[PDB]
Amino acid sequence: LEEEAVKKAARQSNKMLPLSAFEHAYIQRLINKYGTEDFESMAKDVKLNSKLFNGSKLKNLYIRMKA
Amino acid sequence: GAYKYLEELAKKKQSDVNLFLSRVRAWEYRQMNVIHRASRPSRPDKARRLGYKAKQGYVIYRIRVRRGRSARCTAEERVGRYCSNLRVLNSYWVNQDATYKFFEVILVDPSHKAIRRDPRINWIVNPVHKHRESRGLTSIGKKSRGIGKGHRFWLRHNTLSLRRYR
């Protein structure tokens, strides 16, 4: 029972999500104008951050875009 | 929004606003049948907190009972027999005068698909809920038989329990 549960975890081990066309262009457009380190200033922008995501949701988008 | 204002107004019942309305509405209620359909609850806040939703399947019925069992209990039962294809949800005092006590009864249509498909009121479709007022299973039925939790609230006594080894 122990091994099959560990092996079954390995098979279903890709919890990480890919990005989509809308998400990728959203984060990329914010990145090109603000950089890849100043997420606080990214959040405070409203012209580009139309959905008004906070810096923590922008970081996940940036971190997720690489993979 | 305004349902908070409605409930604090309901607390003041001898007030000038409420006393005038109670006298006027008692007159119009007496001019109708003893049991008559209401288009909408006259106290929408009390109906709403007791379970009334403004959707198809829910029904409000106004009934008058001779003042001086509980009148509120008797209102539920008599409305239950009148609209016998409906389950009684709850009931609330609305008006009174020197002769009559007026109650409004919330009933649901168990055969209506909007009630049959709402998981929040689905529970009343089950046949165990036929005539909850007829069995003291409503709010005022439960209180009437002293059902509750505490120290304020028969086969077990008189029996002789004779065990197998004794």
Partner: protein, 116 residues
């Protein structure tokens, strides 16, 4: 009226089969949930340790089991009980830790939509 106990052994058997039925359904996992250890509430019995209802929210926070995932692995949660002394907290935090030591939780299938 006399209550006669001729079905005392027929009740005993029926309860065993209900246990057997309950296992057959969820056989890799215990037929009963785990319980806390609590001290009875009187001067006569407060020196005993007995099974309680469920673990407190302070006990689960300290162990590491959030109140949502606690019930899903058969850990009851009593919101009413509390921890007036550190002895009860540490006695039952260790109980959850030992139970989690022996726990083999089997992975579930998780929806993985193709797009982002």
């Amino acid at each position: 009226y006399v209550k006669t106990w001729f079905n005392q052994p027929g009740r005993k058997l029926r309860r065993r089969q209900a246990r057997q039925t309950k296992a057959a359904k969820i056989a890799p996992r215990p037929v009963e949930a785990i319980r806390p250890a609590v001290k009875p509430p009187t001067i006569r019995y407060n020196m005993k340790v007995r099974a309680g209802r469920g673990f407190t929210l302070e006990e689960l926070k300290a162990a590491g089991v959030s109140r949502r995932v606690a019930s899903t692995i058969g850990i009851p949660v009593d919101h009413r009980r509390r921890n007036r002394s550190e002895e009860s907290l540490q006695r039952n935090v260790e109980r959850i830790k030992v139970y989690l030591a022996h726990l083999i939780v089997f992975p579930r299938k998780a929806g993985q939509p193709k797009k982002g």
